[PDB]
């Protein structure tokens, strides 16, 4: 039996539309006291920021959860699962394919791009939350 807030294995989650939630903002990497996160930003032709690589060194990780609370997209979360063990320390280094799970985890509904002003596919300018339509300077109305 584990409580919901248990600080075991670190995963990266997904949007309800099915895209990866991480926007490679590097706040989780800097807020970690042990320095166990390395990542690089990439950008799609759509314009969506996403991580080119995501690397967590689980030999160094102390499972403090400061990365989860730093994340402004709810992408990185700590799950109730302590079942880890390896013969080699090199196999404690997890890449993005070992971390990205198929769903949204603890926060089923939050999508960051719906908040964001930046324009990606499916959300042009004025299609975000509390956002009006763009008015051109050449418009006849004063």
């Amino acid at each position: 039996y584990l409580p919901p807030r248990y600080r075991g294995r670190i995963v990266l989650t997904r949007d309800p539309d099915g895209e990866e939630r991480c926007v490679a903002c590097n706040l989780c990497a800097v807020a970690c006291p042990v320095g166990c996160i390395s990542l690089q930003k990439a950008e799609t032709k759509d314009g969506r920021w996403y991580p080119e690589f995501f690397r967590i060194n689980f030999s160094r990780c102390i499972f403090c959860g400061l990365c989860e609370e730093a994340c402004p997209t709810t992408a990185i979360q700590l799950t109730p699962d302590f079942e880890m063990g390896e013969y080699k320390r090199q196999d404690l280094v997890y890449e993005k394919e070992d971390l990205l799970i198929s769903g949204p985890g603890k926060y089923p509904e939050y999508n960051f791009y719906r908040m964001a002003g930046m324009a990606i596919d499916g959300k042009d300018k004025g299609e975000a939350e509390n956002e009006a339509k763009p008015i051109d300077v050449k418009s006849l109305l004063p």
Partner: protein, 575 residues
């Protein structure tokens, strides 16, 4: 507010110091430590110190002695010109007041007279200051390195000394072979302490692992520093928010008790008064961890000097306390749940039924503990008069906690200097009959465990409503739901977790009653997002320093019983 900057000129100790040494003989610093801070010259250190020892309500205890580098400190308005400094924290129990004396030093002349004649507990503190800084204490009998080994070149708390292990060359085992050969040839050069001497010199190594060199008891010399983790140095290389996990590991049984003095001290630099719900939540988690530590001390105490068959049921009760902690915070040990301005989350919605189940469960077990320990004769006969000390010995060696309270000195921090809203609770302070020994200390802890359960009874029935985080711009991090929707809250959260919160240049100081003795945090801000100096006063350091004074005239079995009775852990001692 209780955090605003004060010079404490209305404290009555300054006026009699003015009438004794003149107005030009010292200099008063305005801090947020809560105590007067006075800069004296090193030629007057002993005169000022022995004057405070025979005041009509005298200062009897040297709380802490350590140093600061101060060379890279840019905000130094009002202070005298110093290249290094040594601070002396003194406590008067009868006035319920403290004073801090600061001696300024130059970089070429790191020399100050030793304080050991007045206060005996200063011997280990000056050795640490000699170890971590390069201040020489003239007149010290055995001024050797107490943390690092004896061939370690360099003073690690100097600001030119690199903090990280990666900055040095790795463990290539060039020095491991030499340290192994040195350890294999363990011989006495008559330098490891006083060592006057026919005599059998024996090293015995046993809740923590440390070495002691004993003369067969004619002379005993603890060798510590085997658990030095550089926690104080770590404060210089971490932001105020990201340092919080390191606080939890100063004491393993402490948990959220250990985080409490640090967050309260940071909140004084930030100028944050927290809401009432934060106060009751923090007091709740601290009394849960205090109960867990006390049950561990009573459990382990009954096992070594008695039959351990009935008391093994206490593991199930500690499992219930760990399940309640990881239901609230998330993780069983090292929660790192206290935040600057509040806590990490709100209480989850089923907390009340679990706490009520624990409060219903506990009195039957507690009364079985009282029957098992108060009425027993064998352990009582093996614990009465076993390396005892009194009130004069306690105040000399800086012994606080159940030790000091077992003598007639009624001194708790939760009643004398209320913190975290402890003054709105109904609890009693148990006290002994003037003799501190192994039976009296355990009996006091059983009484404290019952008072802790009374505090938890008031927390469940008078849990108020409102936020779990203060409304203040330095509350780190902000509430997450506002961060996920509002740009100004997102901007504050962005800079706080990355560059760090900016604490303005000041010095804060908090003392709390810990699970074992009094634990404190003395923090200095130079205006940056990291601490300039972090000082952690742990009571176990004083408690382990006190043992050669009391054990002299006893057997090795009495040493093992005395070490098992004192409230010492080596993670606290070495930090």
């Amino acid at each position: 507010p209780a955090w605003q900057t004060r010079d404490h000129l209305d404290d009555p100790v300054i006026g009699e110091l003015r009438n004794r040494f003149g107005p030009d003989a010292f200099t008063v610093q305005a801090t947020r430590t809560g105590v007067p801070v006075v800069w004296i010259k090193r030629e007057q250190l002993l005169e000022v110190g022995d004057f405070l020892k025979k005041l009509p309500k005298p200062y009897v205890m040297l709380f802490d002695l350590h140093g600061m580098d101060e060379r890279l400190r840019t905000h130094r308005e009002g202070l005298p010109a110093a290249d290094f400094s040594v601070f002396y924290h003194l406590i008067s129990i009868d006035r319920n007041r403290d004073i801090m004396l600061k001696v300024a030093l130059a970089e070429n002349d790191l020399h100050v007279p030793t304080f050991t004649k007045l206060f005996p507990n200063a011997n280990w503190y000056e050795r640490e200051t000699w170890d971590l800084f390069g201040i020489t204490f003239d007149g010290h009998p055995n001024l050797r390195r107490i943390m690092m080994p004896q061939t370690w070149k360099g003073h690690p708390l100097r600001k030119d000394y690199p903090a990280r292990a990666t900055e040095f060359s790795p463990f290539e085992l060039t020095k491991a072979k030499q340290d192994l050969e040195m350890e294999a040839l363990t011989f006495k050069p008559e330098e490891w302490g006083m060592k006057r001497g026919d005599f059998m010199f024996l090293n015995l190594g046993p809740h923590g692992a440390f070495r002691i060199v004993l003369q067969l008891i004619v002379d005993c010399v603890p060798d510590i520093g085997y658990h030095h983790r550089g926690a104080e140095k770590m404060g210089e290389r971490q932001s105020w928010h990201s340092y919080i996990p390191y606080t939890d590991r100063i004491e393993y049984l402490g948990g959220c008790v250990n985080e409490m003095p640090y967050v309260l001290a940071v909140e004084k630099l930030a100028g944050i008064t927290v809401p009432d719900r934060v106060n009751v939540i923090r007091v709740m988690l601290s009394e849960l961890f205090r109960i867990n530590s006390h049950l561990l001390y009573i459990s382990t105490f009954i096992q070594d000097v008695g039959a351990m068959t009935p008391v093994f049921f206490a593991f199930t009760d500690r499992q219930k306390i760990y399940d309640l902690v990881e239901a609230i915070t998330g993780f069983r040990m090292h929660p790192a749940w206290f935040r600057i301005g509040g806590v990490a989350h709100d209480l989850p919605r089923g907390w009340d039924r679990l706490l009520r189940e624990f409060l219903d469960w506990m009195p039957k077990r507690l009364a079985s503990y009282e029957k098992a320990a108060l009425q027993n004769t064998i352990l009582k006969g093996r614990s009465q008069g076993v390396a005892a000390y009194g009130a004069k010995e306690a105040l000399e060696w800086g012994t606080t906690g159940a030790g000091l309270r077992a003598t007639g000195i009624d001194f708790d921090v939760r009643k004398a200097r209320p913190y975290s809203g402890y003054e709105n609770f109904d609890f009693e302070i148990p006290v002994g009959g003037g003799v501190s020994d192994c039976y009296t200390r355990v009996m006091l802890k059983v009484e404290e465990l019952r008072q802790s359960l009374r505090i938890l009874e008031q927390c469940l029935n008078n849990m108020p409503e409102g936020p779990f985080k203060a409304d203040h711009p330095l509350t780190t991090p902000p509430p997450k739901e506002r961060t996920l929707q509002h740009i100004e809250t997102l901007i504050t959260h962005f800079l706080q977790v990355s560059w760090g919160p900016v604490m303005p240049a000041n010095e804060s100081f908090q003392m709390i009653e810990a699970t074992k003795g009094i634990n404190s945090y003395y923090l200095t801000s130079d205006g940056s997002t990291m601490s300039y100096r972090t000082r952690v006063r742990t009571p176990s350091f004083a408690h382990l320093q006190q043992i050669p004074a009391a054990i002299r005239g006893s057997l090795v079995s009495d040493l093992i019983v005395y070490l098992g009775s004192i409230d010492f852990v080596m993670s606290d001692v070495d930090r």
